[PDB]
Amino acid sequence: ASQVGVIKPWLLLGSQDAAHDLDTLKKNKVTHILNVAYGVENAFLSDFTYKSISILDLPETNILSYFPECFEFIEEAKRKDGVVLVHSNAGVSRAAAIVIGFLMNSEQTSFTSAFSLVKNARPSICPNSGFMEQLRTYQEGKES
């Protein structure tokens, strides 16, 4: 009974249950799965292109440090005319922060606008307060 959020036509956000739900992965046209929890199995190894990046949902984790590895893989799915599911465990903090940061990086949209888009798509998000503050500061130097 998971419910993924649609962030872009090619970018979904969800939980480990979504990642383990072959019926809905197929309905949703998923081609790529980006697993950004810790210790969640990749259940359908022959069926999807996977990338896994271990992340702990703790305020002392620097979510910014995982961005290039995650964002390049999201872009792979887009470039291949596919659909990536970005998921973690509950799918409300690690994976949410990755997607918000992806939007900020790829479109230079603001934190508040990216956060609002993602929460409207997936109303359960609630990133840890460390991730929140990290995302607020992200690319302030660049944007000037």
PDB file of C-alpha atoms in Angstrom:
ATOM      1  CA  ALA A   1       0.000   0.000   0.000  1.00  0.00           C
ATOM      2  CA  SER A   2       2.901   2.442  -0.730  1.00  0.00           C
ATOM      3  CA  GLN A   3       2.277   5.660  -2.675  1.00  0.00           C
ATOM      4  CA  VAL A   4       5.081   7.217  -4.705  1.00  0.00           C
ATOM      5  CA  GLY A   5       5.293  10.942  -5.441  1.00  0.00           C
ATOM      6  CA  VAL A   6       5.794  12.182  -9.035  1.00  0.00           C
ATOM      7  CA  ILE A   7       8.469  14.875  -8.993  1.00  0.00           C
ATOM      8  CA  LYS A   8       9.149  14.958 -12.775  1.00  0.00           C
ATOM      9  CA  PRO A   9       7.686  12.677 -15.460  1.00  0.00           C
ATOM     10  CA  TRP A  10      10.925  10.710 -15.156  1.00  0.00           C
ATOM     11  CA  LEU A  11      11.558  11.104 -11.375  1.00  0.00           C
ATOM     12  CA  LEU A  12       9.583   9.352  -8.602  1.00  0.00           C
ATOM     13  CA  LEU A  13      10.116   9.560  -4.835  1.00  0.00           C
ATOM     14  CA  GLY A  14       9.179   6.742  -2.454  1.00  0.00           C
ATOM     15  CA  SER A  15       9.843   4.218   0.293  1.00  0.00           C
ATOM     16  CA  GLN A  16      11.433   0.761   0.506  1.00  0.00           C
ATOM     17  CA  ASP A  17       7.933  -0.682   0.057  1.00  0.00           C
ATOM     18  CA  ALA A  18       7.670   1.078  -3.292  1.00  0.00           C
ATOM     19  CA  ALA A  19      11.119  -0.249  -4.214  1.00  0.00           C
ATOM     20  CA  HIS A  20       9.906  -3.775  -3.386  1.00  0.00           C
ATOM     21  CA  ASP A  21       6.578  -3.499  -5.212  1.00  0.00           C
ATOM     22  CA  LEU A  22       7.195  -5.019  -8.628  1.00  0.00           C
ATOM     23  CA  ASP A  23       3.548  -4.564  -9.708  1.00  0.00           C
ATOM     24  CA  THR A  24       3.694  -0.789  -9.213  1.00  0.00           C
ATOM     25  CA  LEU A  25       7.276  -0.379 -10.450  1.00  0.00           C
ATOM     26  CA  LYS A  26       6.039  -1.846 -13.739  1.00  0.00           C
ATOM     27  CA  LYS A  27       2.833   0.190 -13.817  1.00  0.00           C
ATOM     28  CA  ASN A  28       4.909   3.304 -13.210  1.00  0.00           C
ATOM     29  CA  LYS A  29       7.327   2.525 -16.051  1.00  0.00           C
ATOM     30  CA  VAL A  30      10.385   2.496 -13.773  1.00  0.00           C
ATOM     31  CA  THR A  31      13.687   1.750 -15.471  1.00  0.00           C
ATOM     32  CA  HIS A  32      16.200   2.967 -12.826  1.00  0.00           C
ATOM     33  CA  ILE A  33      16.195   2.682  -9.041  1.00  0.00           C
ATOM     34  CA  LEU A  34      18.383   4.866  -6.822  1.00  0.00           C
ATOM     35  CA  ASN A  35      18.532   3.366  -3.302  1.00  0.00           C
ATOM     36  CA  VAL A  36      19.752   5.926  -0.765  1.00  0.00           C
ATOM     37  CA  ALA A  37      18.930   4.152   2.496  1.00  0.00           C
ATOM     38  CA  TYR A  38      21.178   1.842   4.505  1.00  0.00           C
ATOM     39  CA  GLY A  39      20.861  -1.917   4.113  1.00  0.00           C
ATOM     40  CA  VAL A  40      17.704  -2.004   1.952  1.00  0.00           C
ATOM     41  CA  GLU A  41      17.902  -4.882  -0.535  1.00  0.00           C
ATOM     42  CA  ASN A  42      17.642  -4.340  -4.271  1.00  0.00           C
ATOM     43  CA  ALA A  43      14.945  -6.899  -4.947  1.00  0.00           C
ATOM     44  CA  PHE A  44      14.739  -7.147  -8.743  1.00  0.00           C
ATOM     45  CA  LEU A  45      18.322  -7.133  -9.939  1.00  0.00           C
ATOM     46  CA  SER A  46      17.612  -8.270 -13.515  1.00  0.00           C
ATOM     47  CA  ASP A  47      14.668  -5.964 -14.048  1.00  0.00           C
ATOM     48  CA  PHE A  48      16.008  -2.442 -13.395  1.00  0.00           C
ATOM     49  CA  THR A  49      19.248  -0.486 -13.477  1.00  0.00           C
ATOM     50  CA  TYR A  50      20.209   0.060  -9.822  1.00  0.00           C
ATOM     51  CA  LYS A  51      22.541   2.395  -8.012  1.00  0.00           C
ATOM     52  CA  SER A  52      22.955   2.233  -4.227  1.00  0.00           C
ATOM     53  CA  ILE A  53      24.508   4.885  -2.015  1.00  0.00           C
ATOM     54  CA  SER A  54      24.541   4.198   1.713  1.00  0.00           C
ATOM     55  CA  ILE A  55      23.202   7.129   3.772  1.00  0.00           C
ATOM     56  CA  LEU A  56      22.258   7.362   7.450  1.00  0.00           C
ATOM     57  CA  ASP A  57      19.276   9.514   8.382  1.00  0.00           C
ATOM     58  CA  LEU A  58      21.082  11.548  11.061  1.00  0.00           C
ATOM     59  CA  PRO A  59      21.382  15.330  11.350  1.00  0.00           C
ATOM     60  CA  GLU A  60      25.196  14.988  11.354  1.00  0.00           C
ATOM     61  CA  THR A  61      25.116  13.289   7.947  1.00  0.00           C
ATOM     62  CA  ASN A  62      26.172  15.745   5.258  1.00  0.00           C
ATOM     63  CA  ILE A  63      23.500  15.133   2.628  1.00  0.00           C
ATOM     64  CA  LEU A  64      25.336  17.527   0.264  1.00  0.00           C
ATOM     65  CA  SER A  65      28.228  15.093   0.049  1.00  0.00           C
ATOM     66  CA  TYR A  66      26.096  12.485  -1.805  1.00  0.00           C
ATOM     67  CA  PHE A  67      24.771  14.826  -4.422  1.00  0.00           C
ATOM     68  CA  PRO A  68      27.043  14.260  -7.469  1.00  0.00           C
ATOM     69  CA  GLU A  69      26.697  10.444  -7.293  1.00  0.00           C
ATOM     70  CA  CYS A  70      22.931  10.685  -6.984  1.00  0.00           C
ATOM     71  CA  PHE A  71      22.276  13.455  -9.465  1.00  0.00           C
ATOM     72  CA  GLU A  72      24.320  11.953 -12.284  1.00  0.00           C
ATOM     73  CA  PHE A  73      22.299   8.734 -12.004  1.00  0.00           C
ATOM     74  CA  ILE A  74      18.968  10.580 -11.992  1.00  0.00           C
ATOM     75  CA  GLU A  75      20.198  12.301 -15.183  1.00  0.00           C
ATOM     76  CA  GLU A  76      21.095   8.920 -16.705  1.00  0.00           C
ATOM     77  CA  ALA A  77      17.454   7.851 -16.393  1.00  0.00           C
ATOM     78  CA  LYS A  78      16.252  11.106 -17.956  1.00  0.00           C
ATOM     79  CA  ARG A  79      18.750  10.844 -20.811  1.00  0.00           C
ATOM     80  CA  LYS A  80      17.651   7.268 -21.510  1.00  0.00           C
ATOM     81  CA  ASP A  81      14.008   8.244 -21.729  1.00  0.00           C
ATOM     82  CA  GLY A  82      13.237   6.200 -18.634  1.00  0.00           C
ATOM     83  CA  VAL A  83      11.986   6.806 -15.104  1.00  0.00           C
ATOM     84  CA  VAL A  84      14.004   6.686 -11.880  1.00  0.00           C
ATOM     85  CA  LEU A  85      12.575   5.854  -8.492  1.00  0.00           C
ATOM     86  CA  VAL A  86      14.621   7.517  -5.773  1.00  0.00           C
ATOM     87  CA  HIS A  87      13.866   5.731  -2.522  1.00  0.00           C
ATOM     88  CA  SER A  88      15.201   5.150   0.942  1.00  0.00           C
ATOM     89  CA  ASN A  89      13.508   3.365   3.858  1.00  0.00           C
ATOM     90  CA  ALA A  90      10.551   5.455   5.043  1.00  0.00           C
ATOM     91  CA  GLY A  91      11.253   7.746   2.077  1.00  0.00           C
ATOM     92  CA  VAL A  92      10.615  10.935   4.070  1.00  0.00           C
ATOM     93  CA  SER A  93      14.112  12.256   4.827  1.00  0.00           C
ATOM     94  CA  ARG A  94      17.176  10.884   2.999  1.00  0.00           C
ATOM     95  CA  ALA A  95      15.426  10.355  -0.344  1.00  0.00           C
ATOM     96  CA  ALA A  96      13.403  13.562   0.030  1.00  0.00           C
ATOM     97  CA  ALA A  97      16.577  15.605   0.656  1.00  0.00           C
ATOM     98  CA  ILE A  98      18.280  14.058  -2.385  1.00  0.00           C
ATOM     99  CA  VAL A  99      15.364  14.995  -4.649  1.00  0.00           C
ATOM    100  CA  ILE A 100      15.048  18.519  -3.269  1.00  0.00           C
ATOM    101  CA  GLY A 101      18.749  19.046  -3.803  1.00  0.00           C
ATOM    102  CA  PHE A 102      18.502  17.578  -7.306  1.00  0.00           C
ATOM    103  CA  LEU A 103      15.909  20.178  -8.259  1.00  0.00           C
ATOM    104  CA  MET A 104      17.999  22.963  -6.757  1.00  0.00           C
ATOM    105  CA  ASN A 105      21.107  21.754  -8.611  1.00  0.00           C
ATOM    106  CA  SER A 106      19.541  20.967 -12.025  1.00  0.00           C
ATOM    107  CA  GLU A 107      17.193  23.965 -12.246  1.00  0.00           C
ATOM    108  CA  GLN A 108      18.677  26.444  -9.763  1.00  0.00           C
ATOM    109  CA  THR A 109      15.303  26.736  -8.127  1.00  0.00           C
ATOM    110  CA  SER A 110      15.110  27.887  -4.572  1.00  0.00           C
ATOM    111  CA  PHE A 111      14.998  25.668  -1.506  1.00  0.00           C
ATOM    112  CA  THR A 112      11.528  26.793  -0.572  1.00  0.00           C
ATOM    113  CA  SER A 113      10.147  26.251  -4.065  1.00  0.00           C
ATOM    114  CA  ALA A 114      11.816  22.809  -4.429  1.00  0.00           C
ATOM    115  CA  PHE A 115      10.670  21.767  -0.931  1.00  0.00           C
ATOM    116  CA  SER A 116       7.087  22.809  -1.684  1.00  0.00           C
ATOM    117  CA  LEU A 117       7.008  20.967  -4.994  1.00  0.00           C
ATOM    118  CA  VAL A 118       8.279  17.775  -3.414  1.00  0.00           C
ATOM    119  CA  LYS A 119       5.955  17.951  -0.402  1.00  0.00           C
ATOM    120  CA  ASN A 120       2.960  18.564  -2.648  1.00  0.00           C
ATOM    121  CA  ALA A 121       3.927  15.429  -4.565  1.00  0.00           C
ATOM    122  CA  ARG A 122       4.701  13.440  -1.415  1.00  0.00           C
ATOM    123  CA  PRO A 123       2.933  14.995   1.590  1.00  0.00           C
ATOM    124  CA  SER A 124       4.629  12.718   4.101  1.00  0.00           C
ATOM    125  CA  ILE A 125       8.123  14.160   3.662  1.00  0.00           C
ATOM    126  CA  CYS A 126       9.807  15.425   6.816  1.00  0.00           C
ATOM    127  CA  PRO A 127      13.592  15.668   6.391  1.00  0.00           C
ATOM    128  CA  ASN A 128      15.734  15.728   9.515  1.00  0.00           C
ATOM    129  CA  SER A 129      16.655  19.192  10.739  1.00  0.00           C
ATOM    130  CA  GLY A 130      20.276  18.798   9.642  1.00  0.00           C
ATOM    131  CA  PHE A 131      19.278  18.009   6.083  1.00  0.00           C
ATOM    132  CA  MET A 132      16.837  20.942   6.173  1.00  0.00           C
ATOM    133  CA  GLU A 133      19.493  23.429   7.204  1.00  0.00           C
ATOM    134  CA  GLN A 134      22.057  21.957   4.777  1.00  0.00           C
ATOM    135  CA  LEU A 135      19.534  22.342   1.912  1.00  0.00           C
ATOM    136  CA  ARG A 136      18.756  25.929   2.910  1.00  0.00           C
ATOM    137  CA  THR A 137      22.424  26.811   2.525  1.00  0.00           C
ATOM    138  CA  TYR A 138      23.008  24.802  -0.643  1.00  0.00           C
ATOM    139  CA  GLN A 139      24.592  26.804  -3.483  1.00  0.00           C
ATOM    140  CA  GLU A 140      24.211  30.193  -1.810  1.00  0.00           C
ATOM    141  CA  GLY A 141      27.772  31.054  -2.970  1.00  0.00           C
ATOM    142  CA  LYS A 142      27.042  29.959  -6.533  1.00  0.00           C
ATOM    143  CA  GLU A 143      23.745  31.839  -6.798  1.00  0.00           C
ATOM    144  CA  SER A 144      25.233  35.026  -5.314  1.00  0.00           C
TER     145      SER A 144
END
